[PDB]
């Protein structure tokens, strides 16, 4: 896998952001995660976490997975890194995302994802208090 530029348009949600990848606008989703939705219980929480590593971020890089690019609704499944930090993980270990959506072929960070997890978990953050 590699990182590839991209520059940030605007922050939307939790999972979700909008880029410009290639010169062209997208909303990217991002991979092996799901945070709750701005309105359910920790979703503003997981909201202000991205919108703040990536808006902070000098460098945002996109890393595709094996697999499919876009899902159904034209969105970007990609790992996504602030500084050479991945949101992915970040959002995970600190209890604002759950790993999820692990669909074959687009699963090569799923183990470093459950580490994290784990460790979230056993710190009792943020959703798992
Ligand atoms: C993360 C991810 C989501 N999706 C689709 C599955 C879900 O379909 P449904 O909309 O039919 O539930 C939806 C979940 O995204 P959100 O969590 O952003 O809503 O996006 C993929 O197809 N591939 C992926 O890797
Ligand atoms: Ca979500």
């Known amino acids: 896998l590699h990182k590839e530029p991209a520059t940030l348009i605007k922050a939307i949600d939790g999972d979700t952001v909008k880029l410009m990848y290639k010169g062209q606008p997208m909303t990217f989703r991002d991979l092996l995660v799901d945070t709750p939705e701005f309105n359910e219980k920790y979703g503003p929480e997981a909201s202000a976490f991205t919108k703040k590593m ?76």
Not at 72 to 98: F, P, S, T, W
Not at 104 to 125: D, F, I, P, V, Y
């Open 54 to 129: 990536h808006e902070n971020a000098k460098k945002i890089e996109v890393e595709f997975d094996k697999g499919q690019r876009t899902d159904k609704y034209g969105r970007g499944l990609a790992y996504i890194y602030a500084d050479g930090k991945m949101v992915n993980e970040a959002l995970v270990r600190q209890g604002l995302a759950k790993v999820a959506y692990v669909y074959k072929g687009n699963n090569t960070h799923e183990q470093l994802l459950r580490k994290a997890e784990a460790q979230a978990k056993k710190e009792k953050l943020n959703i798992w208090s």
